[PDB]
Recover the amino acids of this structure.
């Protein structure tokens, strides 16, 4: 991120602060929770809709002191009224734009938003789990404003959960009770809170939808896989990711020692002494060092992140992931709830600036051996069969004589999103009984309305619909502006929130009351389908054969002689 955009961002932060003052009314309201009363505030949007805002509702004890690295514990109840008229801290993380550490360990909070606290009928509850690679993100309204959803009669809830090493440290020694996945256990405890408390805000605990994008989609899928959450919610939406994506899990049990050493630890590699050191470290020091944790060997083997969701080494009462997510799909309660999945039309455009900084990355397309799924590749990636699989990847994506950056980004869309989606659909068909799954493809490009993640990846002016560009049409943010009612952007906001609300309500994303959806016949994907069909959202809403299908089939062909691994 350039100094020019950093200054522009700081200017936007200040302007947003004063806008939020002008959007705050003097009307406050009290609601009940199982732990005590909370005070919220009525806010306006730039469109002059209004909503009640409760931020900083605790769903767990602050995970500090002896509770660092542990599963969340239920919070202490209070008498009186807890002030929820302002946001709390985000989880400790490196700011995606400023590049300095921010946040606090005191971050286990959720926010609840609704246009009417005493509605005439109990409302669908939509629960958003943010992405950010399990290392960044927040429920702050400068990124995730509820202003578009609250136009309609739903309850919207945005959760936080622990990030980075603080959320995902994992140690083999059973006596230490640090098995991993604390941040996913935070999500579990928040979902239990939502089930138990949403009725106090007008919500229907029998009609909860969990949705999330990127690592939030992997998170939502994990919440559909684990026995810990069986029956807690009723629809799921996986936006650009799932839990069997190769980037969505890692075995990180040996990395706590490495992190401790980077932070000044002088002792030996045993879990007890390593944990003792990490319990005393300042949290900012651990988070700032996370980028250095992966070893030369792990980088060589293309490990994505050092700490993240892991297969837990031993069983505990709160265990979320007892087996690899591919095996968990086989018995998952969430296979039996209505599900919607989708991606954008140029997911890999996300890598534009990375390829500008290091153009030699395109040389990876000469053989493509480094993109072959690890379960199919030999250890050295030199075996003739591995070169043959790489050649199939190359044929799918290299469209001219010499590989290009655009070819690289197209490949990225598939390795990180489309191919894992295909593998999940095919795996899940073998372990479900007719519960429908619906596909969408987000294909609406505008540069009149943008979001902060385009700036974070240095993508202003870059044409195409990249990863996370759809969030602009779901959430208000501090870079947004009021759009005319007749504008293509405004209509896209109405269509996207409208489809998500319709799916959350009924488990079927089609409604003739959504403009442009009248002539849509949106069937779910069947086991017998050889070509997937999806609702493509552009300036129009159209059912189409997934354009990515041919390339998806080319990736699948690598498994022809290894079908047991597909």
């Amino acid at each position: 991120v350039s100094l020019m955009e950093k200054l522009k961002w700081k200017i936007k932060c200040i302007e947003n602060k004063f806008l939020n003052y002008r959007l705050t009314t003097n009307e406050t309201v009290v609601a009940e929770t199982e732990y005590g009363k909370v005070k919220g505030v009525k806010r306006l949007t730039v469109y002059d809709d209004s909503y009640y805002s409760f931020e900083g509702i605790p769903y767990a004890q602050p995970p500090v002191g002896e509770l660092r690295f542990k599963a969340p514990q239920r919070p202490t109840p209070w008498d009186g009224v807890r002030d929820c008229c302002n946001h709390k801290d985000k989880s400790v993380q490196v700011d995606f734009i400023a590049g300095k550490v921010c946040g606090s360990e005191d971050c286990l909070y959720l926010s609840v938003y609704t246009n009417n606290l005493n509605p005439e009928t109990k409302r669908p509850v939509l629960v958003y789990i943010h992405g950010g690679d399990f290392i960044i993100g927040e429920n702050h309204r400068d990124m995730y404003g509820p202003d578009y959803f609250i136009k309609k009669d739903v309850v919207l809830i945005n959760i936080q959960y622990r990030l980075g090493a603080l959320g995902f440290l994992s140690l083999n020694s059973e006596d230490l009770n640090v098995p991993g996945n604390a941040g996913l256990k935070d999500q579990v405890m928040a979902l239990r809170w939502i089930k138990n408390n949403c009725a106090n805000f007008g919500g229907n605990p029998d009609n909860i939808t969990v949705f999330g994008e990127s690592a939030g989609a992997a998170s939502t899928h994990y919440m559909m896989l684990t026995e810990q959450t069986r029956g807690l919610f009723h629809r799921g939406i996986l936006m650009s990711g799932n839990a069997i994506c190769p980037w969505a899990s890692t075995q990180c049990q040996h990395r706590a020692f490495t992190l401790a050493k980077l932070a000044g630890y002088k002792g030996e590699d045993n879990d007890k002494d390593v944990l003792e050191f990490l319990m005393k470290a300042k949290p900012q020091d651990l988070i700032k060092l996370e980028e250095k944790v992966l070893t030369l060997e792990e980088r060589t083997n293309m490990v994505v992140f050092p700490f993240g969701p892991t297969v837990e080494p031993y069983q505990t009462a709160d265990c979320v992931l007892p087996k690899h997510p591919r095996e968990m799909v086989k018995t998952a309660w969430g296979n039996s709830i209505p599900t919607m999945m989708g991606n954008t039309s140029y997911e890999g455009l996300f890598f534009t600036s990375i390829l500008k900084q290091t153009p030699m990355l395109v040389k990876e397309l000469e053989t493509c051996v480094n993109f072959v799924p690890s379960e199919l590749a030999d250890a050295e990636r030199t075996a003739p069969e591995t070169l043959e699989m790489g050649a199939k990847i190359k044929k799918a994506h290299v469209t001219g004589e010499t590989p290009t950056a655009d070819n690289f980004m197209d490949l990225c869309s598939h390795i990180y999103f489309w191919f894992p989606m295909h593998r999940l659909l095919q795996l899940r068909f073998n372990h479900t009984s007719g519960t429908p799954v619906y596909l969408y493809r987000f294909d609406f490009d505008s540069e009149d309305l943008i979001n902060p993640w385009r700036i974070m990846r240095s993508g202003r002016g870059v044409k195409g619909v990249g990863h996370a560009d759809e969030l602009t049409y779901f959430f208000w943010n501090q870079l947004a502006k009021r759009m005319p009612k007749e504008s293509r952007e405004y209509k896209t906001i109405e269509r996207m929130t409208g489809i998500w609300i319709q799916f959350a309500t009924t488990g079927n994303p089609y409604s003739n009351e959504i403009e442009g959806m009248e002539n849509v016949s949106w069937d779910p994907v069947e086991k017998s389908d050889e070509v997937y069909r999806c609702l493509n959202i552009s300036d129009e809403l159209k059912m189409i054969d997934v354009p990515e299908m041919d390339k998806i089939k080319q990736w699948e062909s690598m498994f022809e002689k290894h079908r047991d691994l597909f």
